[PDB]
Design a protein around this ligand. Structure first.
Ligand SMILES: CCCCCCCCCCCCCCCCCC(=O)OC[C@H](COP(=O)([O-])OCC(O)COP(=O)([O-])OC[C@@H](COC(=O)CCCCCCCCCCCCCCCCC)OC(=O)CCCCCCCCCCCCCCCCC)OC(=O)CCCCCCCCCCCCCCCCC
Ligand code: BCL
Ligand code: BCL
Ligand SMILES: CC[C@H]1c2cc3[nH]c4c(c3C)C(=O)[C@H](C(=O)OC)c4c3nc(cc4[nH]c(cc(n2)[C@@H]1C)c(C(C)=O)c4C)[C@@H](C)[C@@H]3CCC(=O)OC/C=C(\C)CCC[C@H](C)CCC[C@H](C)CCCC(C)C
Ligand SMILES: CC[C@H]1c2cc3[nH]c4c(c3C)C(=O)[C@H](C(=O)OC)c4c3nc(cc4[nH]c(cc(n2)[C@@H]1C)c(C(C)=O)c4C)[C@@H](C)[C@@H]3CCC(=O)OC/C=C(\C)CCC[C@H](C)CCC[C@H](C)CCCC(C)C
Ligand SMILES: COC1=C(OC)C(=O)C(C/C=C(/C)CC/C=C(\C)CC/C=C(/C)CC/C=C(\C)CC/C=C(/C)CC/C=C(\C)CC/C=C(\C)CC/C=C(\C)CC/C=C(\C)CCC=C(C)C)=C(C)C1=O
Ligand SMILES: CCCCCCCC/C=C/CCCCCCCC(=O)O[C@H](COC(=O)CCCCCCCCCCCCCCCCC)COP(=O)(O)OC[C@@H](O)CO
Ligand SMILES: COC(C)(C)C(=O)/C=C/C(C)=C/C=C/C(C)=C/C=C/C(C)=C/C=C/C=C(C)/C=C/C=C(\C)CC/C=C(\C)CCC=C(C)C
Ligand SMILES: COC(C)(C)C(=O)/C=C/C(C)=C/C=C/C(C)=C/C=C/C(C)=C/C=C\C=C(C)\C=C\C=C(\C)CC/C=C(/C)CCC=C(C)C
Ligand SMILES: COC(C)(C)C(=O)/C=C/C(C)=C/C=C/C(C)=C/C=C/C(C)=C\C=C/C=C(C)/C=C/C=C(\C)CC/C=C(\C)CCC=C(C)C
Ligand SMILES: [Fe+3]
Lengths: 274, 325, 40, 51, 103, 52, 256, 51, 51, 51, 51, 51
């Protein structure tokens, strides 16, 4: 159904392709040309996962594992039950993610708002793309992508991390991790100000932007502002997604030794006395 | 193209804003010294306003510096007061926790005794800062959401260094005070107790850590998308819903079938961030006290994947083949 | 915000004059390079 | 070959800077790829000639 | 197993470069000379030779001793029995035989 | 601006020069790049502040 | 303890199930807190829908608004609803877009639609209007970037509609909010406001691409030249963003 | 002879700063690439000549 | 000859600050290049000269 | 020497006294901690040795 | 000479704070340099003298 | 000669601060390269003497 104010916004137009052929709503969802492709690709990938689970012998969501082909198969296609099903789902997954981002462009174009949300999602897609196709292409085999399992894809992270003998010493991992722990810190503090100002102690008037602006001035000596926090909050999250893509694309295509050995440039500088 | 609100195209600077005041007399503890930085004003507010210094702020800063000095000056003494070697090994030095042989007793100064004294001052400094956050919210007549959220972070901070060492009965279970060393502790902690990936609370805490970055990217971009409708003025949109809140809600309703309000988004934002250390704190507490091996726990509870392929490299290639000879 | 017919007469005259001067050195340089070390 | 009508649609400021940067980059690229070869590297050519 | 991430990356340029000391050994080794019946042993052909290698045939003794000088980079190895290098080498000969047999 | 950005451009240009200059006299890329990054921030920052 | 209560159900397993129960209650609480605005659902015809969702409406909460503006209980009738919308259904059923019956930018529908906010200016902590022109503001000036006062304004089709005369700022946060445009006689009559988020400032001009030259005369005006009410802000901003789709048929029709 | 029209297009302040920066960098990189060679390295040349 | 007109384009304070920075940094690295070489290092020469 | 009292005209006694107190104690803890690190001036370790 | 005019340019409050932290930081650094040398470490020298 | 006119361009308070910072950093850098060498390191040189 609609909302109390939704009717005045559901106008015709704003599509990127297909016009009014697909321009309608199914329930609350908006269907576009890319909503049709999203439905096809997502459903095809979902069914193929359970088809592979049926042949795997288990339907347990923890134990379902669709794995890439061996490194021997290279960049070519593999038998469906020997790693080819994973490749098809990857094509479906990429098609469903790109369509989802393009569908968001149509929605935000129909509402006359900015395209920040689809652009931010593209960084998430870029991180997924650099894990499943970009990095395997550089390393020369489709078997370097992570498997499609709830707990299996943690084993891929564990072994890939320990393939460089200490993955905490990765300079890009060091930067990327700093962005998660800070984005969550920024999210916690930003969400606290709005909640604290809008929900004061019982019997007290609600607070305006000035009161929360002066709180952090009293608290940490500097306040970034109502607009600045969202502006810097997106940048912290986008940098987190980007630098996480960097830490994994340089592990194997750019660096093959252990990651602690990378810091040997700093230890053995000519300036340091012997 | 259309102007994306990522950098302000023009900045206006007037008299410094000294902040609001009430009968609590906030101004008598304020520094009243302000400075304006234009470089940071391209992305946020350009005023480095006065800071409220009370007693919880002063106590935390003084005790925090003592912890900083004791850890730092021990590191300088470790390399024999060699400043060039202190800089070179700065990321590698630390103040190691006490040896396991001393249990919960006070160890010698050179073998973790200064670690306990330094950790005592850090504990005072962190708790004092929490009290300052709680006191400031009370004096501003605002909600205590900042203090409660910060208390969630302290919960993991307390568990990681205070609560768990007491339960194991050894001060040696604390985290060393080093840049690289507390990364070494993190890796060694996972290896010692099985595989921390299979800790359900570590998995759950990652869900809320990913969700936190997920949701703040979603919220940060949505507000910037509706900032053309005055969407950055979130507080006024709660009290009087404008077109900015409607379009932001309708964008997500048409995308994923449901949305939030301008206030309710910050309840989602608050809870995912707060649940990140709360769940992790429980996972670290159960590690060592209860389980002692997480992968074997996973095998027992039947959520550890099983593999049927071979393991050696001889089952996939040859040494000569890999070398191309 | 646009150019007139008169301006293009002078602008193109200079540009073509500079083009021939630049190419005059280039053809000499290529001629001397081939004698010193031919690539054919 | 008058072809002066081309300048009517082109901003002299933008086109002159665009070609000047491009012209230098093309010359730098040709000189650099010429240095890579072991036969046309005049720096290594002098070393072999002297010996 | 496939998908587990269990793999070892290496640069192809580094793979194509073998151990630089492989050719050094190949330039220093030599085919063994099979002894014939009643061959002259090193113990009786020379003097002051340790019993660990005094039973080697004279050409095998010369072949092995010359190689050990090149392998260890000591041009005067096993010349003076009282030298510390000579005593260490004799014990370390027993080391090498033990590794190839026991281990 | 048009001068702070220009002064920043001189800093990054100097950092590239510092990287290759140190590589010529030995060192390494990462060792040279670190001083190039360091020279970018200091000289580039000073230029943007010393003159505007 | 390393002893299990029954089977393989230890203390670690018990804490996991306790969190599952807590999370289910947390999700129920979080979702209901988001239903304070926009409900009941209604349908395309305006009547309340037969389906309302699995989550019931939350209990009423009261906001004690400052500056003597009374209270506000969010779960209830919405005073921001618009009436006499110039739209018609394109289908007899549900789930299909509405077609404007007149000029969408003038009637305020779709991307150009505003919301019936309060007809009073937003106030700072002191109580004075939040957004004021820099002419009234004392001690305020441009400290960085390009000053847009005096630069000509170029519309979305390249037409020059006037020169920037003033610029409205948020003195509470020291942030620029609007730019005043002195419309030329050939394009308009008086002054118009454009929000800072729809204008790109160049060295010699300010460019607004969402509005053509002919659409500037119909931008909503402010009742007074010293302050702007919340309703006027919502009408002005919606007009410019509505031009991103209604300026010409090329924007409305699909790009491919 | 008519090249003096070039100053009617670009600002002398902008081109002079760009020319000065480019001239130094070009001179600096020519000297640097010349030092990387084993033949035109006057610092190493003196060491070899002295020995 | 009449080079004095350059001050009608370049601000004297704008160039003096840059000229001072450029001259020192040029002199700093030009000294460091000599130290890198094993023939012009006067610190290393004095150690070798004194034997 | 006799007219150093004018330093209190430049300096506010309130902030000087607070700063001096923090510096003096942080100084005193530094040397005391330095002495405890040495094997010769550790009065706690010496007393054990005399036992 | 007539160096007193430096105070017509420098603010005495801001200069005095600047050299107060500079003098101590310089003194602390030099005292730490000696402690890193075997010859000038007076703490370790006393231990050797006792033995 | 007429070098006194530089103060009509440079702000005396803005240049004295830069000069003071530059002079000390230069002095510390030269004092540090001496200690890097084994010939002019007076701390290690004194240790060699009387040993
Ligand atoms: C054509 C399809 C193309 C794709 C096909 C392939 C897709 C594959 C994935 C499919 C996943 C499910 C997709 C959703 C189904 C469609 C939803 C729908 O049409 O409405 C449902 C229908 C409502 O009809 P309607 O068309 O929306 O009409 C308007 C309503 O009447 C008005 O009522 P309202 O205003 O109160 O709001 C209605 C809203 C109300 O719902 C809500 O309020 C949602 C709020 C809670 C969600 C946020 C919490 C999650 C965040 C943390 C997650 C991590 C937790 C990890 C565990 C922690 C430890 C416990 O209902 C929704 O639409 C929400 C749907 C999305 C819910 C979240 C989806 C699952 C996320 C969790 C992942 C689980 C893995 C799934 C993998 C399955 C693979 C087979 O009834 C429901 O609301 C039931 C909810 C459906 C739950 C199913 C979830 C699957 C598990
Ligand atoms: C032994 C293990 C090593 C290790 C090895 C690795 C390895 C290996 C990797 C990381 C990577 C990461 N590590 Mg590490 N790392 C370690 C320890 C840590 C620690 C810690 C506290 O100890 C932390 C915080 C991190 C943090 C991180 C981040 C840098 C990054 C996380 C992934 C990412 O950013 O998402 C980015 C991914 C995405 C955003 C996915 C996009 C999802 C798509 C778009 C959405 C699809 C929706 C889906 C279809 C479901 C929809 C349907 C439902 C209906 C909703 N590492 C340990 C030491 N680390 C990972 C990385 O960087 O990946 C790039 C990586 O590969
Ligand atoms: C080999 C490494 C192990 C590993 C070992 C651990 C360990 C060990 C832990 C985690 C924990 C975490 N892991 Mg893990 N983890 C691994 C793999 C991963 C991966 C991945 C992609 O592979 C990811 C994303 C994560 C992610 C995470 C986060 C979910 C979580 C941290 C909570 C948090 O926010 O801390 C933020 C909290 C703090 C930083 C404390 C805050 C301290 C106080 C509040 C601040 C004091 C400030 C101080 C005084 C300094 C102030 C100075 C200022 C300048 C003034 N892990 C692998 C398996 N992981 C934590 C956990 O379990 O949570 C349940 C944890 O303890
Ligand atoms: C800036 C980086 C951060 C980010 C941002 C981000 N994500 C986003 C957005 C943004 C800005 C959206 O707008 C968009 C959205 O609408 O979210 C509600 C989204 C989104 N990111 C999501 C998830 C997600 N984000 C994650 C993280 C992050 N995304 C980063 C922290 C993660 C991680 C790393 O854990 C996940 C799992 C979704 C909720 C949503 C995208 C929804 C979508 O793509 O829907 C279309 C597809 C389907 C309905 C089903 C597709 C099924 C496939 C065809 C088959 C399976 C493929 C897959 C590889 C399975 C693997 C399973 C195993 C790994 C267990
Ligand atoms: C769990 C979700 C996120 C989170 C939440 C979180 N953290 C928080 C909060 C919240 C909600 C706060 O309210 C609180 C805060 O104040 O934020 C501004 C805070 C905070 N958590 C912080 C950081 C932090 N957050 C972290 C992580 C996170 N916490 C997540 C990202 C981590 C990590 C990765 O573990 C850290 C390290 C602090 C910035 C802040 C409160 C800490 C604090 O101020 O403690 C008091 C200590 C001092 C004042 C002094 C500390 C030591 C100084 C370095 C000494 C001074 C040195 C100086 C050079 C003097 C030298 C003198 C000598 C030369 C003589
Ligand atoms: C202040 O501002 C803001 C708001 O408030 C105004 C907001 O709210 C939000 C939104 C963010 C919030 C936190 C609010 C509430 C939202 C969440 C809690 C989610 C965010 C948190 C997460 C951890 C992310 C996880 C996401 C979840 C749980 C939501 C589910 C997400 C999905 C992608 C699944 C839904 C997708 C579906 C069902 C597929 C899409 C369907 C179609 C395109 C339809 C296709 C149809 C056809 C082709 C036609 C044919 C018809 C068919 C096949 C019939 C089938 C029909 C069906 C219906 C099944 C933000 C950012 C914000 O800043
Ligand atoms: C992994 C999958 C990821 C992708 C997931 C999303 C799927 C798809 C998105 C496809 C977008 C293609 C957009 C092109 C459309 C251009 C049409 C257009 O604009 O011109 C039309 C003319 O028509 C056409 O030109 C017909 C379309 C040509 C087909 C080209 C196929 C490209 C196929 C592109 C795919 C390339 C991938 C290569 C992989 C494989 C790599 C081997 C005139 O205008 P009109 O609308 O008719 O006039 C309206 C009238 O009523 C009043 O005017
Ligand atoms: C391995 O790859 C390899 C093989 C290497 C490879 O890539 C092969 C290279 C390939 C395929 C590229 C092919 C190159 C091509 C096609 C480049 C043509 C070259 C051209 C076009 C030369 C322009 C010269 C322009 C000047 C220099 C004008 C002089 C005029 C100047 C600007 C002054 C004008 C100004 C005024 C008169 C003042 C203004 C007047 C008034 C205002 C009145
Ligand atoms: C130039 O300046 C001078 C000054 C000279 C200098 O050197 C500069 C200082 C320099 C460079 C030091 C740089 C500091 C570094 C690198 C430290 C990084 C720190 C890190 C990574 C922290 C790890 C995590 C710690 C936890 C998780 C604690 C948890 C424990 C808490 C505290 C609980 C309390 C513990 C107790 C035991 C209670 C004891 C109480 C009683 C017994 C009552
Ligand atoms: C015993 O053996 C012996 C006999 C010795 C033997 O071997 C024979 C030796 C032999 C044969 C010598 C081999 C000669 C060679 C290899 C000559 C290479 C050199 C060549 C070919 C040319 C150089 C001169 C280039 C200039 C100097 C161009 C001037 C360009 C100027 C700088 C204009 C650029 C600037 C602009 C256009 C500005 C435009 C502005 C805007 C667009 C805004
Ligand atoms: Fe917000």
């Amino acid at each position: 159904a609609l909302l109390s104010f939704e009717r005045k916004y559901r106008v015709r137009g704003g599509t990127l392709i297909g016009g009014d052929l697909f321009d309608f709503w199914v329930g609350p969802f908006y269907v576009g040309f890319f909503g049709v492709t999203t439905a096809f690709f997502a459903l095809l990938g979902t069914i193929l996962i359970f088809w592979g689970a049926s042949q795997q012998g288990t339907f347990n969501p923890w134990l379902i594992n669709i794995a890439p082909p061996d490194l021997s198969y290279g960049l070519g296609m593999a038998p469906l039950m020997e790693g080819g099903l994973w490749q098809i789902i990857t094509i479906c997954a990429i098609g469903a993610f790109v369509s989802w981002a393009l569908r968001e462009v149509e929605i935000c174009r129909k509402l006359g708002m900015g395209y920040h949300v689809p652009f931010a999602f593209s960084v998430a897609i870029f991180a997924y793309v650099t894990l499943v196709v970009f990095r395997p292409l550089l390393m020369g085999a489709w078997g370097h992508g992570f498997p499609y399992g709830i707990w299996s894809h943690l084993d891929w992270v564990s072994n890939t991390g320990y393939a460089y003998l200490h993955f905490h010493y990765n300079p890009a991992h060091m930067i990327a991790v700093t962005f998660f722990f800070t984005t969550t810190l920024a999210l916690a503090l930003h969400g606290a100000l709005v909640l604290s100002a809008a929900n004061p102690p019982k019997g007290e008037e609600v607070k305006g932007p000035d009161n929360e602006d002066t709180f952090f001035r009293d608290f940490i000596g500097y306040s970034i502002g109502t607009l600045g926090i969202h502006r810097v909050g997106l940048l912290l999250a986008l940098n987190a997604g980007f630098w996480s893509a960097v830490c994994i694309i340089i592990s194997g295509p750019v660096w093959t030794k252990g990651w602690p050995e990378w810091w040997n440039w700093w230890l053995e500088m000519p300036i340091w006395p012997s | 193209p259309e102007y994306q609100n990522i950098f302000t195209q023009v900045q206006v600077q007037g008299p410094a804003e000294l902040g609001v005041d009430n009968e609590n007399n906030l101004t008598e503890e304020r520094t009243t010294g302000t400075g304006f930085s234009q470089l940071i004003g391209w992305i946020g507010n350009a005023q480095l306003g006065p800071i409220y210094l009370g007693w919880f702020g002063i106590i935390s800063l003084v005790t925090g510096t003592l912890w900083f000095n004791i850890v730092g000056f021990n590191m300088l003494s470790q390399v024999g007061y060699s400043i060039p070697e202190f800089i070179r090994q700065l990321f590698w030095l630390a103040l190691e926790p006490p040896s396991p042989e001393y249990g919960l007793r006070m160890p010698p100064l050179d073998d973790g005794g200064w670690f306990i004294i330094a950790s005592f001052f850090l504990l005072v400094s962190v708790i004092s800062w929490w009290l300052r956050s709680y006191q400031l919210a009370e004096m501003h007549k605002m909600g205590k959401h900042v203090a409660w959220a910060f208390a969630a972070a302290i919960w993991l901070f307390l568990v990681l260094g205070l609560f768990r060492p007491i339960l194991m009965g050894s001060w040696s279970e604390a985290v060393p005070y080093g840049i690289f060393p507390h990364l070494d502790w993190t890796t060694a902690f996972s290896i010692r107790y099985g595989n921390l990936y299979y800790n359900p609370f570590h998995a759950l805490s990652i869900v809320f850590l990913y969700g936190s970055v997920l949701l703040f990217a979603m919220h940060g971009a949505t507000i910037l998308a509706v900032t053309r409708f005055g969407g950055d003025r979130e507080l006024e949109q709660i009290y009087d819903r404008g077109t900015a809140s409607e379009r932001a809600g309708l964008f997500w309703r048409w995308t994923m079938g449901f949305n939030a309000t301008m206030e309710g988004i910050h309840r989602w934002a608050w809870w995912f961030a707060v649940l990140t250390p709360i769940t992790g704190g429980i996972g670290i507490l159960l590690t060592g006290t209860v389980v002692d091996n997480w992968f074997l726990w996973a095998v027992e509870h039947n959520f550890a994947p099983d593999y049927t392929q071979d393991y050696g490299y001889e089952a996939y290639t040859t040494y000569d083949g890999f070398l191309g000879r | 915000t646009g150019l007139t017919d008169e301006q293009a007469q002078e602008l193109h005259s200079v540009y073509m004059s500079g083009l021939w001067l630049f190419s005059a050195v280039a053809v000499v340089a290529h001629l001397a390079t081939f004698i010193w070390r031919p690539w054919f | 070959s008058k072809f002066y009508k081309i300048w009517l649609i082109f901003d002299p400021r933008r086109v002159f800077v665009a070609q000047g940067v491009f012209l230098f980059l093309l010359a730098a690229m040709i000189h650099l790829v010429l240095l890579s070869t072991e036969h046309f590297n005049w720096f290594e050519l002098a070393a072999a000639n002297a010996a | 197993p496939r998908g587990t991430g269990m793999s070892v990356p290496e640069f192809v340029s580094d793979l194509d470069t073998p151990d630089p000391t492989i050719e050094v050994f190949l330039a220093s080794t030599s085919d063994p000379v099979i002894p014939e019946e009643g061959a002259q042993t090193a113990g009786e052909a020379y003097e002051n030779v340790d019993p660990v290698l005094a039973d080697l045939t004279v050409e095998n003794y010369d072949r092995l001793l010359a190689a050990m000088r090149s392998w260890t980079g000591i041009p005067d190895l096993l010349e003076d029995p009282d030298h510390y290098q000579s005593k260490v080498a004799i014990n370390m000969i027993q080391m090498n035989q033990t590794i190839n047999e026991e281990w | 601006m048009t001068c702070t950005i220009t002064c920043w451009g001189i800093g990054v240009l100097l950092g590239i020069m510092t990287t290759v200059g140190l590589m010529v006299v030995g060192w390494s890329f990462l060792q040279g790049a670190f001083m190039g990054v360091l020279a970018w921030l200091i000289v580039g920052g000073v230029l943007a502040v010393a003159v505007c | 303890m390393e002893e299990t209560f029954f089977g393989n159900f230890d203390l670690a397993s018990l804490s996991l199930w306790l969190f599952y129960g807590f999370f289910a209650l947390l999700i129920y609480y979080l979702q209901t807190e988001n239903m304070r605005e926009g409900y009941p659902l209604e349908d395309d015809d305006g009547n309340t829908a037969a389906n309302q969702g699995p989550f019931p409406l939350p209990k009423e909460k009261t906001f004690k608004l400052q500056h003597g503006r009374g209270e506000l209980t969010l779960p209830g009738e919405d005073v921001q609803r618009r009436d006499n919308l110039a739209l018609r259904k394109t289908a007899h059923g549900n789930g299909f877009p509405m077609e404007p019956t007149g000029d969408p930018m003038l009637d305020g529908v779709g991307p150009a639609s505003w919301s019936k906010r309060r007809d009073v200016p937003e106030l700072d902590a002191h109580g004075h209007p939040k957004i004021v022109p820099m002419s009234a503001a004392e001690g305020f000036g441009v400290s960085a970037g390009t000053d847009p006062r005096g630069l000509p304004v170029m519309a979305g089709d390249g037409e020059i509609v006037g020169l920037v005369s003033d610029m409205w700022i948020d003195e509470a946060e020291q942030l620029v909010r609007y730019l005043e445009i002195e419309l030329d006689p050939e394009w308009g009559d008086g002054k118009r406001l454009v929000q800072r988020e729809m204008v790109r400032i160049k060295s010699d001009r300010v460019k607004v691409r969402s509005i053509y030259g002919k659409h500037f005369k119909n931008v909503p005006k402010t009742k007074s030249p010293n302050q702007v009410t919340l309703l006027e802000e919502d009408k002005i901003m919606a007009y410019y963003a509505g031009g991103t789709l209604y300026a010409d048929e090329s924007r409305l029709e699909p790009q491919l």
